[PDB]
Design an enzyme around this catalytic site. Structure first.
Site, PDB file in Angstrom:
ATOM      1  N   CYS A   1       0.807  -1.218   0.000  1.00 20.21           N
ATOM      2  CA  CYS A   1       0.000   0.000   0.000  1.00 20.21           C
ATOM      3  C   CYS A   1       0.839   1.268   0.000  1.00 20.21           C
ATOM      4  O   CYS A   1       1.651   1.485   0.895  1.00 20.21           O
ATOM      5  CB  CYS A   1      -0.945   0.011   1.212  1.00 20.21           C
ATOM      6  SG  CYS A   1      -2.026   1.453   1.120  1.00 20.21           S
TER       7      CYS A   1
ATOM      8  N   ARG B   1      -0.296   4.634   2.782  1.00 21.85           N
ATOM      9  CA  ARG B   1      -0.212   4.502   4.218  1.00 21.85           C
ATOM     10  C   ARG B   1       0.001   5.771   5.023  1.00 21.85           C
ATOM     11  O   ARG B   1      -0.082   5.727   6.244  1.00 21.85           O
ATOM     12  CB  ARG B   1       0.788   3.422   4.603  1.00 21.85           C
ATOM     13  CG  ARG B   1       0.245   2.042   4.397  1.00 21.85           C
ATOM     14  CD  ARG B   1       1.281   1.180   3.738  1.00 21.85           C
ATOM     15  NE  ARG B   1       2.230   0.600   4.674  1.00 21.85           N
ATOM     16  CZ  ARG B   1       3.439   0.157   4.340  1.00 21.85           C
ATOM     17  NH1 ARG B   1       3.880   0.240   3.087  1.00 21.85           N
ATOM     18  NH2 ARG B   1       4.174  -0.464   5.248  1.00 21.85           N
TER      19      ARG B   1
ATOM     20  N   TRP C   1      -9.385   5.636  -1.447  1.00 25.38           N
ATOM     21  CA  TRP C   1      -9.610   6.378  -2.669  1.00 25.38           C
ATOM     22  C   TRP C   1      -8.513   5.951  -3.638  1.00 25.38           C
ATOM     23  O   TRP C   1      -7.494   5.389  -3.230  1.00 25.38           O
ATOM     24  CB  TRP C   1      -9.687   7.897  -2.444  1.00 25.38           C
ATOM     25  CG  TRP C   1      -8.529   8.552  -1.765  1.00 25.38           C
ATOM     26  CD1 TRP C   1      -7.342   8.924  -2.337  1.00 25.38           C
ATOM     27  CD2 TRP C   1      -8.475   8.992  -0.398  1.00 25.38           C
ATOM     28  NE1 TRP C   1      -6.555   9.573  -1.413  1.00 25.38           N
ATOM     29  CE2 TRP C   1      -7.221   9.628  -0.214  1.00 25.38           C
ATOM     30  CE3 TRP C   1      -9.360   8.911   0.691  1.00 25.38           C
ATOM     31  CZ2 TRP C   1      -6.833  10.183   1.018  1.00 25.38           C
ATOM     32  CZ3 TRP C   1      -8.976   9.460   1.914  1.00 25.38           C
ATOM     33  CH2 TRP C   1      -7.722  10.087   2.066  1.00 25.38           C
TER      34      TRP C   1
ATOM     35  N   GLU D   1      -3.913   3.418 -11.097  1.00 25.98           N
ATOM     36  CA  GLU D   1      -4.660   2.173 -10.937  1.00 25.98           C
ATOM     37  C   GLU D   1      -5.753   2.066 -12.000  1.00 25.98           C
ATOM     38  O   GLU D   1      -6.044   0.982 -12.499  1.00 25.98           O
ATOM     39  CB  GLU D   1      -5.334   2.116  -9.569  1.00 25.98           C
ATOM     40  CG  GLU D   1      -4.421   1.961  -8.401  1.00 25.98           C
ATOM     41  CD  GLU D   1      -5.187   2.014  -7.093  1.00 25.98           C
ATOM     42  OE1 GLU D   1      -5.656   0.957  -6.609  1.00 25.98           O
ATOM     43  OE2 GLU D   1      -5.322   3.125  -6.553  1.00 25.98           O
TER      44      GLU D   1
HETATM   45  C1  HEM Z   1      -6.519   6.407   1.554  1.00 29.09           C
HETATM   46  C2  HEM Z   1      -6.150   6.046   0.296  1.00 29.09           C
HETATM   47  C3  HEM Z   1      -5.344   4.971  -0.114  1.00 29.09           C
HETATM   48  C4  HEM Z   1      -4.609   4.947  -1.287  1.00 29.09           C
HETATM   49  C5  HEM Z   1      -4.424   6.090  -2.298  1.00 29.09           C
HETATM   50  C6  HEM Z   1      -4.038   3.623  -1.432  1.00 29.09           C
HETATM   51  C7  HEM Z   1      -3.404   3.221  -2.571  1.00 29.09           C
HETATM   52  C8  HEM Z   1      -3.082   1.925  -2.800  1.00 29.09           C
HETATM   53  C9  HEM Z   1      -2.572   1.436  -4.070  1.00 29.09           C
HETATM   54  C10 HEM Z   1      -2.216   2.245  -5.309  1.00 29.09           C
HETATM   55  C11 HEM Z   1      -2.497   0.103  -3.950  1.00 29.09           C
HETATM   56  C12 HEM Z   1      -2.203  -0.844  -5.098  1.00 29.09           C
HETATM   57  C13 HEM Z   1      -3.439  -1.572  -5.598  1.00 29.09           C
HETATM   58  C14 HEM Z   1      -3.181  -2.360  -6.867  1.00 29.09           C
HETATM   59  O1  HEM Z   1      -2.235  -2.014  -7.608  1.00 29.09           O
HETATM   60  O2  HEM Z   1      -3.930  -3.325  -7.125  1.00 29.09           O
HETATM   61  C15 HEM Z   1      -2.868  -0.230  -2.592  1.00 29.09           C
HETATM   62  C16 HEM Z   1      -2.841  -1.509  -2.074  1.00 29.09           C
HETATM   63  C17 HEM Z   1      -3.303  -1.862  -0.815  1.00 29.09           C
HETATM   64  N1  HEM Z   1      -3.811  -0.961   0.130  1.00 29.09           N
HETATM   65 FE1  HEM Z   1      -3.905   0.998  -0.006  1.00 29.09          FE
HETATM   66  N2  HEM Z   1      -4.376   2.811  -0.367  1.00 29.09           N
HETATM   67  C18 HEM Z   1      -5.206   3.631   0.440  1.00 29.09           C
HETATM   68  C19 HEM Z   1      -6.046   3.143   1.448  1.00 29.09           C
HETATM   69  C20 HEM Z   1      -6.136   1.848   1.924  1.00 29.09           C
HETATM   70  C21 HEM Z   1      -6.981   1.432   3.029  1.00 29.09           C
HETATM   71  C22 HEM Z   1      -8.096   2.246   3.672  1.00 29.09           C
HETATM   72  C23 HEM Z   1      -6.580   0.178   3.380  1.00 29.09           C
HETATM   73  C24 HEM Z   1      -7.005  -0.594   4.474  1.00 29.09           C
HETATM   74  C25 HEM Z   1      -7.569  -0.254   5.666  1.00 29.09           C
HETATM   75  C26 HEM Z   1      -5.535  -0.175   2.412  1.00 29.09           C
HETATM   76  C27 HEM Z   1      -4.902  -1.398   2.309  1.00 29.09           C
HETATM   77  C28 HEM Z   1      -4.107  -1.781   1.225  1.00 29.09           C
HETATM   78  C29 HEM Z   1      -3.687  -3.159   0.982  1.00 29.09           C
HETATM   79  C30 HEM Z   1      -3.593  -4.320   1.981  1.00 29.09           C
HETATM   80  C31 HEM Z   1      -3.242  -3.215  -0.285  1.00 29.09           C
HETATM   81  C32 HEM Z   1      -2.780  -4.518  -0.970  1.00 29.09           C
HETATM   82  C33 HEM Z   1      -3.463  -4.847  -2.299  1.00 29.09           C
HETATM   83  C34 HEM Z   1      -3.276  -6.292  -2.733  1.00 29.09           C
HETATM   84  O3  HEM Z   1      -2.485  -7.021  -2.095  1.00 29.09           O
HETATM   85  O4  HEM Z   1      -3.940  -6.702  -3.711  1.00 29.09           O
HETATM   86  N3  HEM Z   1      -5.257   0.866   1.520  1.00 29.09           N
HETATM   87  N4  HEM Z   1      -3.280   0.907  -1.883  1.00 29.09           N
END
Ligand code: HEM
Ligand code: HEM
Ligand code: H4B
Ligand code: H4B
Ligand code: ZN
Lengths: 414, 416
Positions: free
Chosen positions: B120, B123, B292, B297
């Site tokens: 992520c 974070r 968001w 993506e």
């Molecule tokens: C607030 C905005 C946030 C942004 C901009 C963000 C952005 C991202 C991005 C770009 C990815 C890659 C997804 C992909 O390429 O398929 C990602 C993955 C991930 N995010 Fe965040 N994230 C945010 C919030 C969150 C939240 C709220 C959670 C959990 C409470 C979270 C948990 C994760 C996890 C565990 C992944 C792993 C995806 C996977 O293994 O398929 N994210 N995030």
């Protein structure tokens, strides 16, 4: 044991069995992955306080001889058993041994083949190996280097080549080329901490001046070579202009691009890595092929800590530098890589764009799976610096490990 | 120097040491012989299904570790309440074989899982997460109400807010609460007679499952799929999301007027729902989270991937690029305009979104915050660096150390 490797674009799967042949350890452990680090002090082939244990050297040697005879299909012939006998006799008596030219050629090609961070390995079998193990002075190193350059450049129709200087001996200093590449641009640290030229070459430019080089004040001043013969101080050698083919950068549609004065050399020749073949180490073995456009347009010209031209081009193109959301950086970078491909193609100098290169690497992975059951690759280095997912390698899982022969990083001689 | 991974930033030349990895208690896929860091699903980030309850001793050690983490975060480590809670947990595990979290422990663990998520890049927002406790949910219909409430809250008419809804944990001798869909909002993928696909090729399977379960399919590229919700020991029930709940954004380009005519679009809310939330050894098989989007993506992966919408050629043809040769960089040009369209359309429609430059820059800040806070930050370089313009972004030049820390968001096998 054997990793299941998958391509996410095509759904195809392969099992890498070649990684089992790895005898050298990487920086990773099960507790944490360090695969994104450029250089852990581990893999690095640093100096030593004496001669390697004869048991270890002998096992690496026998392994290499086994590889060589297997390659020429004479695995088992008397020639094989006799070559193994020769190696053992020489090591037992002298604590070392020497390779025959045919073996060194196979070894150099195999080190390139085994290079994880290289995207051009589809060309691995086509390599001109210049034997320079009969070199005894810095002045000699210079003539061999100029010969390598004239051969590799070839008026613009680049050819892959490597020049191998004398191996490391336990009783003396190494033969070293202090420059990271045969062709480099000067980096002069100005008054205001600024830098005129390539900021990556600030340290080597300082060393050159220190050893008597009279510097210039341009952004693209080609540096002289600092060649070092065993236990001798390095000597300064200015590369003859006619040998250094350079390409002035201009854009196919943006007329003002040419006005920027940008230019880059044609020959990419790394000269600071160590080539290890059968336990023998070659501290000076410069190698070269041709550039992939992104090395110049993206990394060299657009990196913040390099020429950093992104904003200059953006302003010329008249893009909105106020926000990142306008994607001005992405737009400028695309035109810069375009200018690089256009200029080199106009000058009749060999280049390969990242799409063409990565497609060929995919074919190479296929050739390798059938030939050796795998292929060591460093995903972070293989995927180009721009348009990653737009290339097939981004969607390809990779296994990284160290096979020998191998090109390794080594400490700076100063 | 120090016996911890030395980490370097090549743009600034700064050095840091990762001591946090010392706390990792879960092994990754790599070994000293080979790096398997580029694998999406090695069998080291995936939690297989536990048909039988976790061994009381192994679970209890995971439970104690989590409680210690909780009490440390509130600065009452070694206290009376700490030793009491620890005793209380082993008491539950002793008689029931499992235990249950207090409200604040779930909020803390849920936030820590996001904080601990290596893939992520967003974070920097880990401290601002709305945790909906749905551990009282008893039916598939109630799951739907909870998911609909989540969507409404999180969407907030364009001004998105990070949220997660936690359903009842895994119980021994009882089925799991599972959401079959990979995300709450997904476009249908129709398998054509000739072999091609209409819609999203990534969603071919789930679309077929929805059909097998009573869904009457449409025939467009952007058909929102219904939810296949599963309550314990029951077959999955189909639930259609009301249209007004699913906010979408029609794509248009700021200068290329014909782009709007392409009829492209994407939904505003990115909500992952097939992942398992592991806290203190307890497994929350159903716990959808959302935030968001980052422009790449949608514009790069979803719209330009060869195995997804694959629109690069269509857009290049419209821009009149030489799609016959690689050296024209037509793919690169088109992809840039597609990403610019996603950013422009979301800003115009007043829906939250962040570009890859802003996001990565904020992740560098996060990295600096966590260095001071925990002595490091587990990060998956391959996933942190954006799919386009990699080195134009600061994270490219940042070495990262990757390791598993719990609580964690883990992959889990499909319910089917
Ligand atoms: C607030 C905005 C946030 C942004 C901009 C963000 C952005 C991202 C991005 C770009 C990815 C890659 C997804 C992909 O390429 O398929 C990602 C993955 C991930 N995010 Fe965040 N994230 C945010 C919030 C969150 C939240 C709220 C959670 C959990 C409470 C979270 C948990 C994760 C996890 C565990 C992944 C792993 C995806 C996977 O293994 O398929 N994210 N995030
Ligand atoms: C034939 C044309 C070739 C192309 C287009 C090519 C391209 C590349 C590229 C893009 C890189 C990364 C460069 C960087 O980002 O610093 C690289 C690295 C490398 N290549 Fe190749 N390569 C070719 C030939 C060669 C040859 C002839 C050898 C050796 C005999 C070689 C050995 C390696 C090694 C060892 C690396 C790692 C360099 C490092 O760690 O700094 N390459 N190559
Ligand atoms: C930190 C990170 O490893 C570093 O920036 C790497 C990433 N990938 C790379 N890839 C190539 N080809 N060349 C490089 O110099 C790098 N630098
Ligand atoms: C094979 C390779 O790991 C795979 O294509 C990865 C690379 N990096 C990624 N990075 C992000 N953010 N998301 C992804 O889905 C991927 N896919
Ligand atoms: Zn690794």
């Amino acid at each position: 044991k054997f990793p299941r490797v998958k391509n996410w674009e095509l759904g195809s799967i392969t099992y890498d069995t070649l990684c089992a042949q790895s005898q050298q350890d990487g920086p990773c452990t099960p507790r944490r992955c360090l695969g994104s680090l450029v250089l852990p002090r581990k893999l690095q082939t640093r100096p030593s306080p004496g001669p390697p244990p004869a048991e270890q050297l002998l096992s690496q040697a026998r392994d290499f001889i086994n590889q060589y005879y297997s390659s020429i299909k004479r695995s088992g012939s008397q020639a094989h058993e006799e070559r193994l006998q020769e190696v053992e006799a020489e090591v037992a008596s002298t604590g070392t041994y020497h390779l025959r030219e045919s073996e060194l050629v196979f070894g150099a090609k195999q080190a390139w083949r085994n290079a994880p961070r290289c995207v051009g390995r589809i060309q691995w079998g086509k390599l001109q190996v210049f034997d320079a193990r009969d070199c005894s002075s810095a002045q000699e190193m210079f003539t061999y280097i100029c010969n390598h350059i004239k051969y590799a450049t070839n008026r613009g129709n680049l050819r892959s080549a490597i020049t191998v200087f004398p191996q490391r001996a336990p009783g003396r200093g190494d033969f070293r080329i202090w420059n990271s590449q045969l062709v480099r641009y000067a980096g002069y640290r100005q008054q205001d901490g600024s830098v005129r030229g390539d900021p990556a070459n600030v340290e080597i430019t300082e060393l050159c001046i220190q050893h008597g080089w009279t510097p210039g004040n341009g952004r693209f001043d080609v540096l002289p070579l600092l060649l070092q013969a065993p236990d001798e101080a390095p000597e300064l050698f200015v590369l003859p202009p006619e040998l250094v083919l350079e390409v002035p950068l201009e854009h196919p549609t943006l007329e003002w691009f040419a006005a920027l004065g940008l230019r880059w050399y044609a020959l990419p020749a790394v000269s600071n890595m160590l080539l290890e073949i059968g336990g023998l180490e070659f501290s000076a073995a410069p190698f070269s092929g041709w550039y992939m456009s992104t090395e110049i347009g993206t990394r060299n010209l657009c990196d913040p800590h390099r020429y950093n031209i992104l904003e200059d081009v953006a302003v010329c193109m008249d893009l909105d530098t106020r926000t990142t959301s306008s994607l001005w950086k992405d737009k400028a970078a695309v035109e810069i890589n375009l200018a690089v491909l256009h200029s080199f193609q106009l000058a009749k100098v060999t280049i390969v764009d990242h799409h063409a290169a990565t497609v060929s690497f995919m074919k190479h992975l296929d050739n390798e799976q059938k030939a050796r059951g795998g292929c060591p690759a460093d995903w972070a280095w293989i995927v180009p610096p721009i348009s990653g997912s737009l290339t097939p390698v981004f969607h390809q899982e990779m296994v990284n490990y160290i096979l020998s022969p191998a090109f390794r990083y080594q400490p700076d001689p100063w």
